[model samples]
Target chain A: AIGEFMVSLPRMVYPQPKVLTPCRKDVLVVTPWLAPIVWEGTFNIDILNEQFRLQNTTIGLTVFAIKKYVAFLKLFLETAEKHFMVGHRVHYYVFTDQPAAVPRVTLGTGRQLSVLEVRAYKRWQDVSMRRMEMISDFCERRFLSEVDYLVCVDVDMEFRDHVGVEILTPLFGTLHPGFYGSSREAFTYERRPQSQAYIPKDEGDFYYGGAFFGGSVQEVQRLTRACHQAMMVDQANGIEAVWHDESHLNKYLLRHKPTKVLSPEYLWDQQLLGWPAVLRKLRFTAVP
Target chain B: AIGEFMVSLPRMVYPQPKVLTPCRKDVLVVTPWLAPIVWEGTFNIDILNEQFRLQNTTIGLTVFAIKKYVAFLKLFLETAEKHFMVGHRVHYYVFTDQPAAVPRVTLGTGRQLSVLEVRAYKRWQDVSMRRMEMISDFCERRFLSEVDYLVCVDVDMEFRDHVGVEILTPLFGTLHPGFYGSSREAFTYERRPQSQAYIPKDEGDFYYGGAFFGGSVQEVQRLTRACHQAMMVDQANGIEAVWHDESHLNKYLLRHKPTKVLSPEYLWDQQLLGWPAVLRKLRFTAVP
Candidate 1:
């Protein structure tokens, strides 16, 4: 019931890992806290697939398609079927204000979708808190009992490449496409001391995107609960974080480091910043 | 008192990790279960040092030099001072039968040593079981109270390069030099179905050396306790495993996978295996 580590990997054939060669000499493949900085060539999906499949892993995809955002659901769900954890069990929880507007995108075998009703909001923190409340409610119903991991993302994004078990971990965050290459000072973190999300210029590992983040249900629950409380404190203090939910997320991950880090490849904006030679695979991208 | 993860790392300047280039094209850096395979290029010591030091991390090294094996202590302890966890807090727990024979090696700042007396035994399994008892005894007095992580290694070997905090995790094991290039069928795992250390020819991640293994104090305790019990069961059955504790260690790691897997660079037999082009850094090596 609690986190299980009794995973016995089944026998699988794959290329043997060479002892001397560097996995990625051009980029940092790992974080300072020893979390893997997931890149294309760093993993053997054949092996990872066997490991995750043996657990009969059930992945829950949480997307907020509230009000106007519900219009993006059709393309989002259709493309997700093509790239996200294709062979594994997937449960899509679409949180929306207009349930009837959610398109009936046909899901593949071992996949299902559910429409979750929620109120639309303007300030990012309000939406983030409401998102947490709905997720916590589902945890009491099916999420805690059925899902092994949860991946929360924006509805205005589409998958372009593989995003499977490689991203599954206890806790994880995707790098912001705009700041992955920039210095810490260039990051758009809440600089105001009055805000709970305040971060000094010199103190940051990476600026994580607010659009996509996920982890084991327990870890996600812990994260959302903490984020909500921090937002509450900031609201009481009469200040809003510069980047809203993202600023608080950056603060949360700085103090409590994630177990794994998805490269900018997991959360890119090919529309804003055209695909560079650096990103071999632009897996997920934003919409206009 | 329990394990702590609330470590806030200090700001450190380092080269940014690129997302395109593979860290090692010839090698696999991350395992199927997402445990990092520690290599030279896969880490940033500056980042890691800041993180560990911020937590005031204290690493406990458990080494056995029972009987005549105490002759290796002078070189082992001397080299450890120059290479092992140099900047971090280190507590070297030297277990030996001849306490008077333990060399008085000069210590570095923030590093300490303790000589533990134990009965010497011929069988490797007996020595392993005795090691667990001595360590468990110290847990009541010092280890559980003093150390944050414990690293168990053989004293016959000496540090040839940096063998530092990169290996510390909840649990970890080094790839055996003899089997890193070989397939599961070629790995020298215990074969007899009657023994607890037995593994089928088809199932194995890597051939982990018995000479080096460790983890968090609690995890180490659990591993050592489980290994001791398995050895006892095998002894009662009148069937000692082929490679003794090393064999049992494989079985334990197979079912209860390690959080990190050290590369062959961590354990090499230069006298036999010789320095291959693949081994960028030979961190530890055999003497005889």
Candidate 2:
């Protein structure tokens, strides 16, 4: 019983020569606009943990592992046990094409997992976009009653550090590592004015990665439903968004802003983007 | 009716001489633990304004003006008209000994003020801390139904710039300009072990300004009730916290962390702190 919930974080020791500070001192950590950008150093995790724990917060983590993506679940689930909301009540909702193929990973006392079999898609775009529809459908059926907060992420990823409740908010989107430092013009927002995902060159606060985004059940439901509907409209018009689910997500967030914006630390590729001096800890990253 | 609600913010034009960047490129804007520190450039006010307005959010501003402080109401009320939640519904609850002495400042459409009579304290410390008791008492009687959020601030201060709904959260405290950059050891929290406001040197997220703090009626009620009870316990024990009400405020916030920590911009003193480059605009400040 003692070992069931006992999760300890190793004290991080960095060489004495380096110290980190805010990247943009002139700009506010929270946007003047009010959306909280989830970044390290901006929050006191201990405070958040206590606050949420007092509420008996139950977080629901949703992941899609259609086809070959199911291969990524072993490392993902194992690493999650070590870092993701260890002391809190967590429900892992695994949506896959084959429930029987889902790995039997042991969970802690307060943590549980449910394998939800979803239809396999013929194309990657269909798989990606349909994930939104599936998530929205479940939000109404189970997520609303089962969890206080819902975190949706791609299966091809693993927890690298403490991916705890600090990332939880009413609604949040992670800053894509590919565009965090880029200027607004450099962002690859869909340019086609005809598409629902079209965002002008001058607009956009950050380019959010579609692989990671979530919120309260209601907010997540709103987001996924909007994205699914938008994708359907584009399909009827024979115009798929530039990045499939990702493009629609950017547009949804642009119009209906996220309550919280996550920093690049939440979603990074250690190989593609080498360990920059800027990132103190890469919480969650790509499997590759 | 249209003219009464229309608000126009002046276009700010500054010479693009030097582009400022984040102070610490390596760390996050929000602390790693998850308390949102409100800062400029971190939020988009336009986006926030729309979100609040959509909910038809009503904000109640609470102020205490006993004895001589009643003189400060005219400027506070007038300036609040120019900068506070202009388009939204606002009810100003002015707690004072002399209700007739309250300023008859004209309010825009959807805005109103009610002067609540309360006994004046002979000592300034009693008056300051008693404000918590008064607010807590009214939380159940009227404030709960009157407003979606409550903003408690010092009566002696004025709104110098845009002090809108951006500050509204479930629970929030303004970062005192005097100690924003100071280390934890430098915070002026009461150090006496006997006092209820005692905070060990190692603990504390931000040294919150006593003059400004608030939240939803329920949260504000919880905070005020807790502070009042703590203060009463200290009084019964014949121990007064250093810095009076401010000390107690810091202690309460330390144990029950604020959901949002407003930057120094939300509460500043031009003469004492001066106009630092980091502050884009001093929204609410002390009177010289």
Distance from true position, residue B166, model 2, in Å? 2.5
Candidate 1 lDDT, A147-196, residue by residue in tens: 99999998899899999999988889999999888877888999998888
lDDT of 2 by residue, A11-119 (tens): 2222111112463454334544555565555565655666667677899999988778889999999999999998999999999888888898988989999989887
TM for candidate 2 is 0.84
How does residue B225 of candidate 2 score in lDDT?
84
- For the predicted complex of model 1, DockQ is 0.35
Q: Which candidate leads the pack in lDDT?
A: 1
Q: Model 2: residues >4 Å from true position, as ranges?
A: A1-29, A39-44, A120-129, B1-20, B23-32, B39-41, B120-129, B181-186, B270-280
Number of the top-ranking candidate, with TM-score as the measure: 2
lDDT of each residue in B62-113, candidate 1, tens digit only = 9988778999999999999999999988999998889999988999999999
Query: What are the lDDT scores of the predictions, listed in order?
Result: 0.82, 0.78
- Tens digit of lDDT per residue, candidate 2, span B66-128? 889999999999999999998889999999899889878999999999989997678755765
